[PDB]
Amino acid sequence: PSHSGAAIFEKVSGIIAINEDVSPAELTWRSTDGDKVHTVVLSTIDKLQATPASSEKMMLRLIGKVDESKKRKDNEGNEVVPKPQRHMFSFNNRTVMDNIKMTLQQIISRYKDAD
């Protein structure tokens, strides 16, 4: 129950695996049947969202760091304020999602401590 937890992506089912051996560490979701795969950079994970156990609502959200200070221009020639990254995953076992939320926290805090 570490660096891997059967997670649902885009309403689809699959396993979510995390690898801290790569820099920046990333998370890869692999369908159950192997029809869909997803990859996410954990190093950006600025906030971890998880549904409480008491809440029948099963879900897990990942928040990626931003950089509005960059100030990107739009097609209209006007500056815009970029938005922060946010992923949405669904789990069936509070334990599995509990591991992901716990493991992910270890990664953020890992980079947070450095800075």
């Binding site: 969202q49 549904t51 409480p52 809440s55 029948e56 609502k57 879900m59 949405m88």
Partner: peptide, 14 residues
């Protein structure tokens, strides 16, 4: 329909 909708899932009700 909107992001706020999914956010409610975390708020739920006692």
């Amino acid at each position: 329909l909107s992001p706020d909708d999914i956010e409610q899932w975390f708020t739920e009700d006692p």
